[PDB]
Amino acid sequence: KVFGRCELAAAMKRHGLDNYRGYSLGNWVCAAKFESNFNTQATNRNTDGSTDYGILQINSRWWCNDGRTPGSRNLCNIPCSALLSSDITASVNCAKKIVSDGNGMNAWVAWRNRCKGTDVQAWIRGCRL
Ligand SMILES: [Cl-]
Ligand code: NA
Ligand code: NA
Ligand code: NA
Ligand code: NA
Ligand code: NA
């Protein structure tokens, strides 16, 4: 599913991401835009052989099991395919574990390079929330 901007904001808010660990909703929508272009089915292969999955491009090296990343962990205890669902629950629940692990949203390279230190509230401007 390809989300609209305000549709995704509303879904993330309902799942408790607004201000989660101090990150306002616009941060999460900005990260989703540049990680996946709001597409839950996005995948991308990394140089080390791991793969990033879903709307927030969660990596199989640490967070989910895809059966083809040897020596990796599965810290969210989910198959990576669950992160491609039109229902973002699994992605959101795993993202909450990632953002609490000490590095905050810096775990998402696109957030650090394209959202951090910008007016992220623009990403939810105009939305009915
Ligand atoms: Cl980047
Ligand atoms: Na879909
Ligand atoms: Na915001
Ligand atoms: Na790829
Ligand atoms: Na894994
Ligand atoms: Na959803």
Numbering used by the authors: 1 to 129
What did the authors write?
The lysozyme crystal structure (structure factors and coordinates have been deposited under Protein Data Bank (PDB) entry 6QQ329) was determined from a single continuous collection run of 5,000 images (yielding 4,086 merged and scaled diffraction patterns) on a drop containing an estimated 4–6 crystals with dimensions ranging from 100 to 800 μm. We have exploited serial crystallography data analysis tools to analyse detector frames on an individual basis, given the absence of a fixed axis of rotation for the levitating droplet. Although all patterns from the best single data collection run were included to optimise the data metrics of the deposited dataset, as few as 500 images were sufficient for a 96.7% complete dataset to 1.69 Å. A more detailed analysis of the 5,000 image structure solution run reveals the presence of multiple lattices and their respective motions during data collection. On any one image a maximum of three lattices are detectable, occurring on 154 images and indicating an absolute minimum of 3 crystals in the drop. The largest continuous run from a single lattice is 2,260 frames (maximum separation of 3 between consecutive images). Exploiting the fact that near complete data could be obtained by relatively few images, further investigation of radiation induced changes to the protein structure was undertaken by comparing datasets formed from the first and last 750 images of the 2,260 image run. Isomorphous difference maps showed no significant or obvious features. However, a comparison of the two 750 image subsets did reveal a drop with an I/σI from 6.06 to 4.23 over a resolution range of 39.75–1.70 Å and from 1.14 to 0.69 in the highest resolution shell (1.73–1.70 Å). This drop in I/σI suggests that although the obvious effects of radiation damage did not appear to manifest in the electron density, they were still present.
A technique which does not introduce any crystalline non-sample material into the beamline is acoustic levitation, where the sample is presented without contact from external supports as has been previously demonstrated for MX at the Swiss Light Source. Protein crystals are suspended in single, microlitre sized droplets, coated in silicone oil and presented acoustically to the X-ray beam. The device both suspends the sample and also imparts a modest but sufficient motion to allow for a complete, high-quality, rotation style dataset to be recorded and processed in an efficient and routine manner. We have presented results demonstrating the potential of acoustically levitated, oil encapsulated drops as a physical mount free method for Macromolecular Crystallography experiments.
